[PDB]
Assembly symmetry: D2
Homo-oligomer: 337 residues x 4
């Protein structure tokens, strides 16, 4: 039977990334990438929490505070991420939500990883301090061809590492790799991410659905039937509670932690959904799957879609397996031509 000695342990992200990189016997290029990533997130957390806002408001006379307008969070975050990653000498191509074109890393600093990220997701709404975050996805470059936007166009099934940082009431980094999903809490007093949850698995079935019902008018009959069954359960059991923030990271994170289902279906206006494929759906789909949930467009898996455009959009539904399944069946029941 199992037995044990004495072991007290504090696991920091940095420690974790090195160990895993050691187990994997990697050259350490990816380790440098995750490290640079952790450093990017920390710098975005401090900006999002508003440290320094006083300088923008004339505490030092604002003689020298190029913030005012010449320092928006959306862009600063893009800048920080772009710069910190090129500075890792581990990436060859970067796809950001903020850049129309793929960034092709200078020959001098090229590495083999492709990184698709959304610098400050849900930022449109922080005027009212809504939870925001950073979503990222990492692919290995396969072609021996000169790096190009093309290398970013790989299904989500090909992700080597994927995750997000949630700048909520506290800052969390969720990292998912082949071996699994782990959650790290940022201690902002020492600037270290402490593994607070190891090997995260999502509930089989949850009690919360998450969707923007203002679009009810434009919802396809499958969603309509699902939602109605959530509110008025035929078996006269308890209806699902409802919550929906409007920031993907916040909604998906809650879904992961408490279970349930998140949905941002296709509706005529955004006939192919609103959420972008490469740096929102894919990374979240990958995370969901590593934790044991499902992520579908309604017709097919998100991770199996092959993009033909970096800024391509895709509908998406994710959450506990028994719930996504219950909705997939409903899609099959109405599925035709």
């Amino acid at each position: 039977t199992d037995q044990a000695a004495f072991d007290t342990n504090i696991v920091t992200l940095t420690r974790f990334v090195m160990e895993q990189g050691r187990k994997a016997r990697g050259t350490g290029e990816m380790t440098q990438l995750l490290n640079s990533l952790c450093t990017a997130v920390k710098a975005i957390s401090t900006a999002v929490r508003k440290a320094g806002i006083a300088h923008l408001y004339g505490i030092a006379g604002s003689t020298n505070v190029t913030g005012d307008q010449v320092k928006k969070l959306d862009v600063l975050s893009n800048d920080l991420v772009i710069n910190v990653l090129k500075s890792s000498f581990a990436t060859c191509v970067l796809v950001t939500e903020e850049d129309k074109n793929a960034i092709i890393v200078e020959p001098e600093k090229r590495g083999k990883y492709v990184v698709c990220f959304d610098p400050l997701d849900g930022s449109s709404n922080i005027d009212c301090l809504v939870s925001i975050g950073t979503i990222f996805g990492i692919y290995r470059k396969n072609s021996t061809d000169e790096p190009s936007e093309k290398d970013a166009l790989q299904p989500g099934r090909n992700l080597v590492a994927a995750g997000y940082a949630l700048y909520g009431s506290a800052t969390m980094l969720v990292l998912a790799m082949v071996n699994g999903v782990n959650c790290f809490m940022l201690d902002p007093a020492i600037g270290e991410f402490i593994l607070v949850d190891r090997n995260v698995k999502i509930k089989k079935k949850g009690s919360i659905y998450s969707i923007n019902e203002g679009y009810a008018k434009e919802f396809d009959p499958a969603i309509t039937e699902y939602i109605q069954r959530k509110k008025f359960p035929p078996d006269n059991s308890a209806p699902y509670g409802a919550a929906y923030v409007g920031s993907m990271v916040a909604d998906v994170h809650r879904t992961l932690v408490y279970g349930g289902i998140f949905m941002y279906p296709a509706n005529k206006k955004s006939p192919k959904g609103k959420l972008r494929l490469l740096y929102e759906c894919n990374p979240m789909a990958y995370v969901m799957e590593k934790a044991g949930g499902l992520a579908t467009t309604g017709k097919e898996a998100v991770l199996d879609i092959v993009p033909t455009d970096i800024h391509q959009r895709a509908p998406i539904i994710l959450g506990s397996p028994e719930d996504v399944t219950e909705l997939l069946e409903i899609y099959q029941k109405h599925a035709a031509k």
Copy 2:
């Protein structure tokens, strides 16, 4: 004005509060109270963001503490507020959501104000880093008898100051008093709330409705008809967007900034409503009216209700005047008899 160009100096809460105290020719007792809530909010903020969590997870060796259950945030928060409050020498009665009874302050620290608060609102949801907050309502004692639970039972109309702090992507303090509502952004680098928005006013009409539709099966006919008109406008106008965090300060705050309507009426498991009157409804109503919005229960104004119990619940509907008005109209159409 003699001559003043594009100028705007830095105003800290502390400076602001003191000016207003002098304008009011106060003895400085309320100022010490406001000063103490500020400090209280700053300490909770820090604890919310998880500064120092490393220690809990054994970074310096968990020598011999009684597990992980050392500092439960809602309780730490309760402690901080109560203690920095008693230390202001400005309070005689304190009513807390975490306490079954009203807390009567020792005559040595006994002052004239009665303070109602919710130290950490939305704390059950904290596991998923959702924005949480602190709500406070301040009453001037209007009696000659020993302070008691009774001094807290005054309608919200008798409030002298009310506000809240939202711990979201950034910490913000919204303070409402006789003249208007003002918003202070916390610059954590220096422990100071900077005045970023003054004499705030909610939009006349908004485009977002906030309600937990997981209760649609239990809503009254007016709420039902109302929710239905936002989704499928009878006059074929654009439908209202939907958003509901499930945490009040974040929901009420999004409502104040962008406009729209927030609702928490009674249902089949909370006939009196879920939100508490003294420390949840009244403070947000007072802020709403001061911002130029409305706060109704569907049939009467929240501030006019006469409490009979300190932990009394009450339904509430608050937001932009034109939306709250519209729902009231609907509530009249279905009138009782």
Copy 3:
């Protein structure tokens, strides 16, 4: 007292200052001034500790700034103090070490106090992370004429409040006023100075002498004889320990806490002394006398000197009463004629 056991509540600077304002039945103008110095000290503290340096070193991409010379600390500090000072509406004249002239405040912001300060003392030594500080002296304006440089030229005996903040291994504010000296420790997690030491008094006699002996070749015979007696006691008692940081606030502060004597007399390249009267000598003298120590030039008390120029220098010797007394005795033995 009625009955009070082992009790001691938390006192923040803000709370303290306000209480003292009420006891003094002030109009609250000095309080706004003290409040503004506090905030000023907190912002400098943060800039000293290097919070946000990453940005300067290109973490978010040095887009197009004019090099590394963006924010020179002594200048940032100057700016902050001056601006948060003018914004208190409590100052008419400001004298700064960084400014050749006295700064006369616009009549709109014009108040009654005159503030002398050294925003960042010991800044040339900052390259090697040595403790630096801020020194302030506050004079009540005693004239009827337009405020001018002249209102600053009052002997230290006319100071209403004086103190300093030391940015060492921790930020501490030492404040001296009519009643006594009190020390506030900055808890950076919450932007609050906690009262840790009240009504402080320097030791009658100490065991450390502080002087830059790199000037032994230029010292007068009394200083020389004095330094000699501490090293080789004539009565064969234990010799005094030596310590000299080369930064005043750190040297004066070590002197206040442990006792002993600090000296900065004239030599062969500074006949008037090196330390400035208005914003270096006077504040530390006032604090020293309030703590129960002495501050002499060797021949006269520092607070009694009548300034003729705002950037006037003066030798100074301060510390425990019995040590300062001993040196004065020696200065008499070698008297002039």
Copy 4:
């Protein structure tokens, strides 16, 4: 001739440690060690800067704040270092200034490095906020014998990595390895150490000597002659300035940055000096040498001494090469039997 493309770069300690570890083709065990070390320093910086002091002073009623007395800085720092290092699975033996005996790392977490450290050096004096720091030295374990105190007993010449962290007005980490010395500044807003000085070299000759002259009575004739020549230069040039804090890290750091000489000679009381060999002298000697300075006991090199006790002491003189040399000659001039 030399030419170049375009390169913007931010180097964090973590990045630097990984690259160097990659160049060195190490298994990555040492990288994990330096990483754990960086995390230890950050946690000590936050404690030293006093974050959380308010909880000790009853802000939350102190209901749960096991600080008071049951949380001293000296020990906490020891605890943090000991724990964080054992948690790296890279050390087999630890020698701390605070532990009488060598700590022998559990078989389960043994690695091959020996670490000799002083957790909070100069701590005796932080009551007056004097600069303090952390000094560390790392040896590779050579014996194939079970780890023992013995493995710590190696001359300083055998150090693989050595350095210190200075908790001054800002926090700096100085890391010296075979390839050289680099200085990293801690950005406490993001918790990252940014390389601010690359390949540090000390001035050939400095203008400052650093020594505690209170012991003049007991100084050997060599020191006596040296010092006198510093104050009264025979060539009638400028005398050396004098500075001496009383915290080794602070004095040695200043010496490194501006040049000069630091001395803590043998004097009857501490006939073999006061500074301990293994975790004060050795690490500082190693740093000095990698930067091009000298470190001698007066008779022999510090790095060549073979210790026979972990807590052994040793006299020490270090600084610019031309000055240490000028004193070594003076030792030779008086050298006899």
